[PDB]
Design a protein around this nucleic acid. Structure first.
Ligand SMILES: O=C1C=CN([C@@H]2O[C@H](COP(=O)(O)OP(=O)(O)OP(=O)(O)O)C[C@H]2O)C(O)N1
Ligand SMILES: [Mg+2]
Ligand SMILES: [Mn+2]
Ligand SMILES: [Mn+2]
Length: 328
DNA sequence: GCGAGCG
DNA sequence: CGCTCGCAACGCA
DNA sequence: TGCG
């Protein structure tokens, strides 16, 4: 049929192909229209607050998740008037205009473009040199899974954050692991925030060394949860809160309370189930913006590691370097 | 999914 | 016109 | 010249 128009909180968004299948395993429950309806359910409320003012990359499947994948950082030169952008700087020093999430219409436009997963930077525009978010990525290695991740998050990481006077917010990744966010004052750069995250990861590890590893080299990790400290680098992003994932059942990265995480199963949260699960339930991340935390406690961990003779760790193998940057 | 470049 | 082609920043095997 |  011809295209239709969605009125998204006052902004008109062109919408096509509602019945195109994106998730074959789900049949009629895996159409592009189902995906747009899910995003309409979350983009005005809890998802928008967590994405607000952030530049994002888009992981697009215009022909569904078994077709071509388009990972897109730059915004197309020609695009609707209602989309806003902001300037990000990549590890090489190149800059680009990235889509900035300012209104539910930009999430719905992304969905119309086939975006399954949104990937926000850890900064807010326009101060895109200073993260306001430290990310902890609990990544089960072969032989481990979500049970290990939720156990380590609840029993090791959360009590450590309590001891440090820090508050963190957990979500399922929608894969096998767990993400934990700390809102921080935007007072430190990517290098400093990443060092803080390395010191946090090393402290989690030394509290549960049989369950946790920070080893960059895979042959040393074993059947343990890896804390991927490099996710705090520049141009390293995360699937956003409330993003659908490229899994056969369209799982969703789901914010939880710490109490819920203890017994959670990530397959419970999909683009088909999440809206009904939010109804009547307090947003567990309602307070994330209420306290702009200092990195101070984690930078103390950094200095203590330096006294142990432990400094920086390798960046990812593909990681660029800026002409003036320090040892990668 | 869509615009730019081609023939 | 219809049709194909980018859409990732990057170091490496 | 691809891999991911
Ligand atoms: O080259 C890349 C490739 C992925 N990136 C981002 O990082 C995450 C990678 O997530 P990952 O930990 O590898 O796996 P998950 O999707 O989080 O599921 P999991 O819990 O099973 O690990 C996805 C993107 O937002 C990135 O920033 N740069
Ligand atoms: Mg917007
Ligand atoms: Mn992960
Ligand atoms: Mn990871």
């Amino acid at each position: 049929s011809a295209a239709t128009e969605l009125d998204v909180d006052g902004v008109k968004v062109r919408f096509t192909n509602p019945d195109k299948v994106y998730f074959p395993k789900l049949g009629k429950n895996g159409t592009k229209g189902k995906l747009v309806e899910y995003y309409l359910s979350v983009a005005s409320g809890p998802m928008l607050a967590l994405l607000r003012d952030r530049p994002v990359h888009l992981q697009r499947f215009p022909d569904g998740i078994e077709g071509e994948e388009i990972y897109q950082k730059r915004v197309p030169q020609k695009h609707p008037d209602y989309l806003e952008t902001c300037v990000v700087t990549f590890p090489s020093g190149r800059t680009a205009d990235a889509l900035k999430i300012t209104h539910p219409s930009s999430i719905i436009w992304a969905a119309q473009m086939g975006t399954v997963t949104l990937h926000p930077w850890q900064v807010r525009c326009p101060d895109t040199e200073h993260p306001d978010e430290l990310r902890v990525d609990l990544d089960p290695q072969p032989g481990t899974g979500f049970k290990e991740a939720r156990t380590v998050a609840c029993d090791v990481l959360k009590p450590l954050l309590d001891e440090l006077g820090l508050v963190g917010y957990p979500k399922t990744s929608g894969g096998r692991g767990v993400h934990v966010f700390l809102r921080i004052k935007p007072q430190w750069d990517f290098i400093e925030v990443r060092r803080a995250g390395i010191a946090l990861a090393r402290e989690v590890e030394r509290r549960a060394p049989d369950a946790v590893t920070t080893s960059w080299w895979k042959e040393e990790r074993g059947e343990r949860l890896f804390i991927d400290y490099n996710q705090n680098a520049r141009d390293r992003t995360f699937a956003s809160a409330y993003s659908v994932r490229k899994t056969p059942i369209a799982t969703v990265s789901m914010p939880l309370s710490w109490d819920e995480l203890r017994n959670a199963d990530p397959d419970d949260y999909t683009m088909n189930t999440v809206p009904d699960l939010l109804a009547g339930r307090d947003d567990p991340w309602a307070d994330i913006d209420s306290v702009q935390q200092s990195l101070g406690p984690l930078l103390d961990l950094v200095a203590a590691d330096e006294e142990r003779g432990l400094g920086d760790l390798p960046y990812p193998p593909n990681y660029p370097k800026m002409p003036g940057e320090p040892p990668r």
